Amino acid sequence: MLMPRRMKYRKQQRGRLKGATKGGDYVAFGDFGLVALEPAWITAQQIEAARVAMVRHFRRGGKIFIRIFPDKPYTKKPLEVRMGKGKGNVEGYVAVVKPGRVMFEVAGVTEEQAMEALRIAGHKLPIKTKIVRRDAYDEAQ
Amino acid sequence: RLTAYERRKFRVRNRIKRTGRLRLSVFRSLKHIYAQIIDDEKGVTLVSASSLALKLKGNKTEVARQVGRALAEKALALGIKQVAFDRGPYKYHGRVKALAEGAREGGLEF
Amino acid sequence: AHKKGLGSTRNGRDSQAKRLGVKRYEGQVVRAGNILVRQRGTRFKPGKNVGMGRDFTLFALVDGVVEFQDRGRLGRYVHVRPLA
Amino acid sequence: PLDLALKRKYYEEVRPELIRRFGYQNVWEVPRLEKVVINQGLGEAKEDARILEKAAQELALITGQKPAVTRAKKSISNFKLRKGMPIGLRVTLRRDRMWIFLEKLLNVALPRIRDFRGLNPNSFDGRGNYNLGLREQLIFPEITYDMVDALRGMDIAVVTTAETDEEARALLELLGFPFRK
Amino acid sequence: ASEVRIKLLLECTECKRRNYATEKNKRNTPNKLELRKYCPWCRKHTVHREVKI
RNA sequence: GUAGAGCACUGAUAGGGCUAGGGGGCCCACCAGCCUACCAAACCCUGUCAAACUCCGAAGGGUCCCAGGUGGAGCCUGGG
RNA sequence: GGUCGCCUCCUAAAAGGUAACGGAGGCGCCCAAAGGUCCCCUCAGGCGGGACGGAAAUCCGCCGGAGAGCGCAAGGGUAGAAGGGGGCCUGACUGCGAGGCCUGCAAGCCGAGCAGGGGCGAAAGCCGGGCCUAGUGAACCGGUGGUCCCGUGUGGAAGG
RNA sequence: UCCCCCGUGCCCAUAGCGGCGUGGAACCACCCGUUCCCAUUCCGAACACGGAAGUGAAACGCGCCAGCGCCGAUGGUACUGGGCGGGCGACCGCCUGGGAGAGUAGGUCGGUGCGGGGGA
RNA sequence: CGCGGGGUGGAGCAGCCUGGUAGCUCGUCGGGCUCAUAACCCGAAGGUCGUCGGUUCAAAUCCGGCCCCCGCAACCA
RNA sequence: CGCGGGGUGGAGCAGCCUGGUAGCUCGUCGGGCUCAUAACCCGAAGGUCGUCGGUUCAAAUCCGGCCCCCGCAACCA
Numbered sequence A: 001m002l003m004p005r006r007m008k009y010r011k012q013q014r015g016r017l018k019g020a021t022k023g024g025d026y027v028a029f030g031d032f033g034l035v036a037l038e039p040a041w042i043t044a045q046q047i048e049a050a051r052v053a054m055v056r057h058f059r060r061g062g063k064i065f066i067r068i069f070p071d072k073p074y075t076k077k078p079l080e081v082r083m084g085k086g087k088g089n090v091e092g093y094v095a096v097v098k099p100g101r102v103m104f105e106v107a108g109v110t111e112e113q114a115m116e117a118l119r120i121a122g123h124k125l126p127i128k129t130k131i132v133r134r135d136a137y138d139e140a141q
Numbered sequence B: 001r002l003t004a005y006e007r008r009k010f011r012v013r014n015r016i017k018r019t020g021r022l023r024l025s026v027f028r029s030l031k032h033i034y035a036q037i038i039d040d041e042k043g044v045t046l047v048s049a050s051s052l053a054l055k056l057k058g059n060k061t062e063v064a065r066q067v068g069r070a071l072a073e074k075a076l077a078l079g080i081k082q083v084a085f086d087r088g089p090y091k092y093h094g095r096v097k098a099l100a101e102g103a104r105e106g107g108l109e110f
Numbered sequence C: 001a002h003k004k005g006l007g008s009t010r011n012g013r014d015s016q017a018k019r020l021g022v023k024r025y026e027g028q029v030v031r032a033g034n035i036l037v038r039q040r041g042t043r044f045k046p047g048k049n050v051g052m053g054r055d056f057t058l059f060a061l062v063d064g065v066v067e068f069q070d071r072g073r074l075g076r077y078v079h080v081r082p083l084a
Numbered sequence D: 001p002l003d004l005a006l007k008r009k010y011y012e013e014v015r016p017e018l019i020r021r022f023g024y025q026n027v028w029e030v031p032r033l034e035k036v037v038i039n040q041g042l043g044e045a046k047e048d049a050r051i052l053e054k055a056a057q058e059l060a061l062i063t064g065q066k067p068a069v070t071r072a073k074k075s076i077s078n079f080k081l082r083k084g085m086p087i088g089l090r091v092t093l094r095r096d097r098m099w100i101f102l103e104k105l106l107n108v109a110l111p112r113i114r115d116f117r118g119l120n121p122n123s124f125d126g127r128g129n130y131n132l133g134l135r136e137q138l139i140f141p142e143i144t145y146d147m148v149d150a151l152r153g154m155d156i157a158v159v160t161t162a163e164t165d166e167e168a169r170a171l172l173e174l175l176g177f178p179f180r181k
Numbered sequence E: 001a002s003e004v005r006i007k008l009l010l011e012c013t014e015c016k017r018r019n020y021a022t023e024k025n026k027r028n029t030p031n032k033l034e035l036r037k038y039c040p041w042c043r044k045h046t047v048h049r050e051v052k053i
Numbered sequence F: 001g002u003a004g005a006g007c008a009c010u011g012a013u014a015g016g017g018c019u020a021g022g023g024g025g026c027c028c029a030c031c032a033g034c035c036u037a038c039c040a041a042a043c044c045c046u047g048u049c050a051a052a053c054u055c056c057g058a059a060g061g062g063u064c065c066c067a068g069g070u071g072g073a074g075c076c077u078g079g080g
Numbered sequence G: 001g002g003u004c005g006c007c008u009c010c011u012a013a014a015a016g017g018u019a020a021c022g023g024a025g026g027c028g029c030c031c032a033a034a035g036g037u038c039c040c041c042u043c044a045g046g047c048g049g050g051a052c053g054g055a056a057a058u059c060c061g062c063c064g065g066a067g068a069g070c071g072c073a074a075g076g077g078u079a080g081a082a083g084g085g086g087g088c089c090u091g092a093c094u095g096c097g098a099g100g101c102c103u104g105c106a107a108g109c110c111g112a113g114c115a116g117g118g119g120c121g122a123a124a125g126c127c128g129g130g131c132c133u134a135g136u137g138a139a140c141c142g143g144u145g146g147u148c149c150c151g152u153g154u155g156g157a158a159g160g
Numbered sequence H: 001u002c003c004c005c006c007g008u009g010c011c012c013a014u015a016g017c018g019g020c021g022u023g024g025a026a027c028c029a030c031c032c033g034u035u036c037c038c039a040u041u042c043c044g045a046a047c048a049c050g051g052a053a054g055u056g057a058a059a060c061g062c063g064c065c066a067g068c069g070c071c072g073a074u075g076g077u078a079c080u081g082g083g084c085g086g087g088c089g090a091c092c093g094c095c096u097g098g099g100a101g102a103g104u105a106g107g108u109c110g111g112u113g114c115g116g117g118g119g120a
Numbered sequence I, J: 001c002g003c004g005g006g007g008u009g010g011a012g013c014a015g016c017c018u019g020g021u022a023g024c025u026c027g028u029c030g031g032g033c034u035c036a037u038a039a040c041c042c043g044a045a046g047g048u049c050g051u052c053g054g055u056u057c058a059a060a061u062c063c064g065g066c067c068c069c070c071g072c073a074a075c076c077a
């Protein structure tokens, strides 16, 4: 999993999600990255899920980079309880993701091989995705 | 970053400045002693009486007592009575003290 | 039913709003005494014709007109240029 | 301001060897003493018994001055400190009193220690000063024996206008410092 | 107040009428108080003390 | 002082360099060798997240002056 | 079950204000010094040195704008002091109070200036407690001390 | 009336840090002493007086450059007041005034106001 | 707020009632005896008689202030 | 979740309120007694006080959260 080992407050507000991403819009370490196309709350259990996927795809090899880190606490009321009497309890953590953000990028492996281990990676993901190539544009910022 | 010297200035300086009444700054080196009356609004000098321009010499303290009395004449003739005393980063005593007692007896008002 | 045996909270309060801020805006004609500004701390400093009470409440010392001056590193000041 | 033979030794001997050494231009920039802070940080009369100044009377017989106390900066459970207890003493020696102290230590007291073997030379500051310590207190016979009690010592810095540790040594060595190395 | 912090009316001497009242500690300084206080009654400055409240 | 944005402060943070400590070696076990595809503070680089973080900062909103504004506007004292 | 008054921050959408069994924390005290004033000092921290003596006891050196401190929670503030030390002190006065903040009411809050008589300071000045924002209770019924106002035909005393 | 120092403001780091040079003629600083006034929870360090042998080494004044600090547009984008639109929904997009923060090109080792002194 | 009685060794504690030594038994070390453990027997340890302050030749006993705990009696807008 | 309770030398109990104070009983190890064992007499040994983090100069102790143990409602017409 991926808890932030420590934190300033425990329960976090919910928040909107208006518009286009803030940063993380260019490859930076790998040579191929995975790109978000629609807003989301990606979960500690998904990030992990997608990661493990590729690692088991090119077993012994590559270097997986992971650009979004689940810091926000997903909160939720128990079952058979009604509205109010406290705010929900924490179960799991998430990372806010807008469209354009890179989430994974792998470095150093056969072009075919990265193009799969990032393809499979997307299916573990709750959203639409596009794989991308490191770029003159990317090295241009 | 600051020296205790310049802090003491501001300190002693700041208060007096808040009461509006005129300002008789007292500068003092190991050689001579100087002074000048200042309106701090416009930021201008009313009259300046110094040990060096007066060309006096013959013991530093007693030197000053005259330069104080000198300042009063050169200002009474101008119309100043009300003026509060700035004693710089110096303890009011002896040399600076003299300048005051001189200005005091010359008819000046603080 | 529906209500059963949950629980509650440990927190839940809040203090009475203090309604502070700048009370007089620059160019407002003031009587002597008007509170120009309410505050905690010195976010504004006492200028010409302006006092300060044991709660940093600045107040006009003579009739005139509020003026506002940001003198940078030594802060904002509030004065009154008494229309004579 | 007083006829002391070390004041005169610094001038009529130590001053020149330095100008011939590091080849100074101006006269003031030549290395020169400043103070000798002696810290008798006892830490043993905190909320402990009186008697603290019973050394700050012998401390006066050494240094000619009256030592003034030092208090507890902050409270510590492991030392038994509450923010305010007195732990030690400190005298700052300026002007000729400073000299005449060294004109007794450097050539009478330093040899009065048993198993003595010069001075530690790594202990120079970095911007031109030097210090160490001492344990035995009747190391100057101004403190005679039947003033007997528990023996305690002092931390001692010496402060100079030396600009580096290098030239600094040359001063302290030239004014009679036996160096262990 | 509580119990270690006692309440008290500042007494008097130069007319023996009380004219003030305040607070103090008896576990800190366990004596009788001390302040100069002009009075509307004697029209003079006087040294004052205490009695319970 | 918000949206944005930002990391200067309070914190989070993934990779890298540096690098106290800690752990596995192991030389050896008296002190000491300083060697580590292991952990890891403080720091530097790339790269990021925050209602109770802001080096910055909109549109906007408030309000006073001037002008337009004769309206089932406005203002005061009262009865329902 | 939890809650009920007051304070701090957030929610609150850049004036004020704003809800919820919304997220977080504090108060029901304390101080004759922690108050007044006149005077002087400047931090936390980091690296080198330092007999005991250490991660930190006291010491020396450069280094540093405030990340320390300011009684307690938090916020704003703050060294050009509000912080740290000393000398003298008691304005932790009385008789008042222009004008305003806030505001349904009742409340709460800020206050220049006048008189009286003091304090500290040569002095300009400053003091009607505390850096500020919590540290609390209407009316009724009584207790205590003054006043010398009322007191049932007059003077007392009882009582107000 | 230009120049140089001393005092003192105004501006609020384009002014600062660090660096190289530098000026004692006059001012200024260090400086000489500790009798006197004044001072140290110890010390003439500071503050204080009495002077004037030395020195501009320190501090400071003035010059030099961009290592740091700092100021930093234009173009464009974010967001947005007003007005509209297509989506089953998630959300996107259009006209209209407004328009950042980052970042780029760059700027900067100051500018000043009255008084005093001192040479053009 | 108002009335009753008090500390005396570390506890407990009459002495105090009555103006003359600070004390009974419980507790320590020591000796005795000791199956041991008991109880027992000898001995010393130990104190400022809440505090000042006072009447007296003198005080634990007596008076004033006070102080602190026990208790009692009421009242609580 | 929600109320409240206790976690401490091997077993079982104090010490928490009032923040610097590891206590008792077994048990254990090591000396005796006795032919031997227990009984019994004589010495010693032994725990960062559940656990993270907390406030104070420090935490058995004051302080928040999951980890345990334990009664513990949860009416559901």
Ligand SMILES: CN(CC[C@H](N)CC(=O)N[C@H]1C=C[C@H](n2ccc(N)nc2=O)O[C@@H]1C(=O)O)C(=N)N
Residues within 6 Å of the ligand: C001, C002, C003, J075, J076, J077
């Ligand atoms: C049940 N009764 C008498 C009470 C009423 N007359 C009849 C009755 O059925 N009362 C019950 C009816 C519903 C009530 N109930 C239950 C669950 C719930 N969530 N809310 C409720 O009110 O619990 C009641 C209760 O026990 O009194 C007795 N045992 N005496």
Ligand SMILES: [Mg+2]
Residues within 6 Å of the ligand: A126, A127
């Ligand atoms: Mg989905």
Ligand SMILES: [Mg+2]
Residues within 6 Å of the ligand: B040, B041, B042, B043, H009, H010
């Ligand atoms: Mg001006």
Ligand SMILES: [Mg+2]
Residues within 6 Å of the ligand: C009, C010
């Ligand atoms: Mg609760």
Ligand SMILES: [Mg+2]
Residues within 6 Å of the ligand: C014
């Ligand atoms: Mg509210």
Ligand SMILES: [Mg+2]
Residues within 6 Å of the ligand: none
């Ligand atoms: Mg309320």
Ligand SMILES: [Mg+2]
Residues within 6 Å of the ligand: C074
């Ligand atoms: Mg300021």
Ligand SMILES: [Mg+2]
Residues within 6 Å of the ligand: D001, D002, D003
């Ligand atoms: Mg001589």
Ligand SMILES: [Mg+2]
Residues within 6 Å of the ligand: none
């Ligand atoms: Mg110190």
Ligand SMILES: [Mg+2]
Residues within 6 Å of the ligand: E019, E020
């Ligand atoms: Mg009164």
Ligand SMILES: [Mg+2]
Residues within 6 Å of the ligand: none
């Ligand atoms: Mg890691």
Ligand SMILES: [Mg+2]
Residues within 6 Å of the ligand: none
């Ligand atoms: Mg090792």
Ligand SMILES: [Mg+2]
Residues within 6 Å of the ligand: F035
């Ligand atoms: Mg190696």
Ligand SMILES: [Mg+2]
Residues within 6 Å of the ligand: none
């Ligand atoms: Mg290596």
Ligand SMILES: [Mg+2]
Residues within 6 Å of the ligand: F043
């Ligand atoms: Mg780091």
Ligand SMILES: [Mg+2]
Residues within 6 Å of the ligand: A022, A096, F049
């Ligand atoms: Mg974001």
